[PDB]
């Protein structure tokens, strides 16, 4: 029966490829030929945040565009007030191997996790001023990767065990498991309507998942190596993903095809983080060359370069108001650019 | 009225900074070690003499060491291992005792040695279960490493007075096979510290202590252009 199933799978893949080819009437690079370029984009480091002792692995903006949470390999989370550069909280962690961290959209909770396969949720709204662990989620069989709050009562996590999970924080139980990846799942991105999310893996592929049903709605491919970062286009109709190929790709959910490739002949290093500006016209990508390049989403031309970190740029983030871009690195510093 | 909020924020920042200074001193006073090998190698026996990740703490001559044993992680280790680019050394345990396990260990060592984010860390190499290789060779290397047919024990070898030469030359052949990888690169930024050991011993802690001493001393000597 195995040979018949293999042949059927090949036939279905050919049918899907033909269906995708049927829609390739024109490229984005042709439609956008009549769109004025963004010009030269320049940014300056507006704030530098110090206090971490080791690599900064994760960073996430608050919904008020003023607080930051960052996680370092010292075993600490730091909550900063970006307008004053003062630290608001410092949270010691049970284990120092933290790969992800997340800020709740309500500002009440902070999540983190990493090589201990456990996602810890801390309650910031503490009556005593002492931040305590509000819960631990311990259902994964591999190192924990990007995690994102869906609301105060639900969190979506990904891990190295090839699965994703929707957890109910109130009971500490998994309410949905999303399976179908074969490699480690590296990054999550939630849709602006929090009904779908997109997950990239070490299969050189990404999957669009339906939160409520638990099914995989769409599979996108086109990268040559592992996908390290993924984000949603502001209107929710596209992804931008970065991989170890030293390339970034914009995918369209309705056409079910790769829409644009951002790459350069002089870039042979991988991409660590990807984010969009408020309007979606500027695509920001952090690279292992210790630098972050700014791209023009519509015209795929390099616009500007952010320089200053002296080690690999681990994380990148843009505020909900779009006012500033925060960048983290392995040199233990955060930078807030205009 | 915002002046009072600013003052309170400054006070909280000052408290956080004091705690961070204490934590910085404690962090800088500790050496972190990565332990690799969780197969036929007697890693658990070494750990006993010394959940995604387990931690073991020990002290040698009032120097604190923090060793990290890898727990529930998949066979794919390309992305995970990048978390350990700041350890002082990697402790690699290979059993010298059915597939070519030694070739697999050599390939993993070669991968770790040449990784962009790991090619500054020295490797302390434990060649474990020397007695099972001693038993086997005295009653299978030539069928996996044909060049061993032409290997001769070297001039600086220090075998035990009761060791059969057939065991000495095999142990030193394996050690030289690891050193052949370690010596081909690094430009002096990292070195390998091979050791022979039994599954159960008491000198492992002292040997790790001395290897860390040599690693840090060599790093400092490199800094001052004295080496």
């Amino acid at each position, epitope marked *: 029966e195995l040979d018949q199933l293999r042949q059927e799978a090949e036939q279905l893949k050919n049918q899907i490829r033909d269906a995708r080819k049927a829609c390739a009437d024109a490229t984005l690079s042709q439609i956008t030929n009549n769109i004025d370029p963004v010009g030269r984009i320049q940014m300056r480091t507006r704030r530098t945040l110090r206090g971490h002792l080791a690599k900064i692995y994760a960073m996430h903006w608050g919904t008020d565009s003023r607080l930051l949470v960052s996680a370092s390999q010292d075993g600490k989370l730091i909550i900063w007030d970006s307008y004053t550069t003062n630290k608001v909280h410092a949270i010691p962690l049970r284990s120092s191997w933290v790969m992800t961290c997340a800020y709740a959209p309500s500002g009440n909770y902070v999540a983190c996790g990493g090589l201990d396969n456990i996602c810890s949720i801390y309650n910031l709204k503490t009556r005593e001023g002492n931040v305590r662990v509000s819960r631990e989620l311990a259902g994964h069989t591999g190192y924990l990767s990007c995690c994102r709050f869906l609301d105060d009562n639900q969190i979506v996590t990904s891990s190295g065990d090839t699965t994703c999970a929707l957890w109910d924080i109130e009971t500490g139980q998994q309410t949905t498991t999303f399976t179908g990846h074969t490699g480690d799942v590296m990054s999550l991105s939630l849709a602006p309507d929090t009904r779908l999310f997109v997950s990239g893996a070490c299969d050189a592929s990404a999957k669009l998942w339906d939160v409520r049903e638990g099914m995989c709605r769409q599979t996108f491919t086109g990268h040559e190596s592992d996908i390290n970062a993924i984000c949603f286009f502001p209107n929710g109709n596209a992804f931008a993903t970065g991989s170890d190929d030293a390339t970034c790709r914009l995918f369209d959910l309705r056409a079910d095809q790769e829409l644009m490739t951002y790459s350069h002949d002089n870039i042979i290093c991988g991409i660590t983080s990807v984010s969009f500006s408020k309007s979606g016209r500027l695509l920001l990508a952090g690279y292992d060359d210790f630098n972050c390049n700014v791209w023009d989403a519509l015209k795929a031309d390099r616009a500007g370069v952010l320089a200053g970190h002296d080690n690999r740029v681990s994380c990148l983030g843009v505020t909900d108001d779009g006012m500033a871009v925060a960048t983290g690195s392995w040199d233990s510093f955060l930078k807030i650019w205009n | 009225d915002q002046r009072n909020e600013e003052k309170a924020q400054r006070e909280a920042n000052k408290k956080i900074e004091k705690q961070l200074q204490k934590d910085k001193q404690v962090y800088r006073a500790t050496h972190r070690l990565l332990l690799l090998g969780a197969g036929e190698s007697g890693k658990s026996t070494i750990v006993k003499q010394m959940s995604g990740i387990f931690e073991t703490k020990f002290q040698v001559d009032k120097v604190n060491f923090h060793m990290f044993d890898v727990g529930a992680q998949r066979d794919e280790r*390309r992305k995970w291992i990048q978390c350990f680019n700041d350890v002082t050394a990697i402790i690699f345990v290979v059993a010298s005792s059915q*597939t070519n396990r030694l070739q697999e260990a050599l390939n993993l060592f070669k991968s770790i040695w040449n990784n962009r984010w790991l090619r500054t860390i020295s490797v302390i190499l434990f060649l474990n279960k020397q007695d099972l290789l001693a038993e086997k060779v005295l009653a299978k290397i030539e069928d996996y490493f044909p060049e061993f047919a032409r290997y001769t024990t070297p001039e600086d070898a220090t075998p035990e007075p009761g060791e059969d030469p057939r065991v000495t030359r095999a142990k030193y052949f394996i050690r030289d096979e690891f050193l052949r990888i370690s010596t081909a690169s690094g430009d002096g930024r990292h070195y390998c510290y091979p050791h022979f050991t039994c599954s159960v011993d008491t000198e492992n802690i002292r040997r790790v202590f001395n290897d860390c001493r040599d690693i840090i001393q060599r790093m400092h000597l490199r800094q001052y252009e004295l080496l």
Partner: nanobody
Amino acid sequence: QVQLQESGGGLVQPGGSLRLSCAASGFTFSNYKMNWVRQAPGKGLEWVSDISQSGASISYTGSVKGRFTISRDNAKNTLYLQMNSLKPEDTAVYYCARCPAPFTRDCFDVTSTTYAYRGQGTQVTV
């Protein structure tokens, strides 16, 4: 989409030759170090040989040294393995594997259980 396809095999006699081929589709071939890895029935996966990006550095296993020849053609986008003077212990499923990162010398997850950057392999029975 990265996809590798193997070709060759069949029932062979001990002491004969066999040419295994590996065709690539979905990536640039001349940037990745290439691997040949076998798996015997009843045993796990074991690494046989590798050839570098430009084809300069060629390395083998000691059990297969002097009897196997790994080559690559970056222009024709293919990977060849010549198998002369065979042995009855060499009956295995052969895979052509790709290292995940371009422009590097290290390859971590080539000889692993669930790896997605290699083909389905071919049966070589002596």
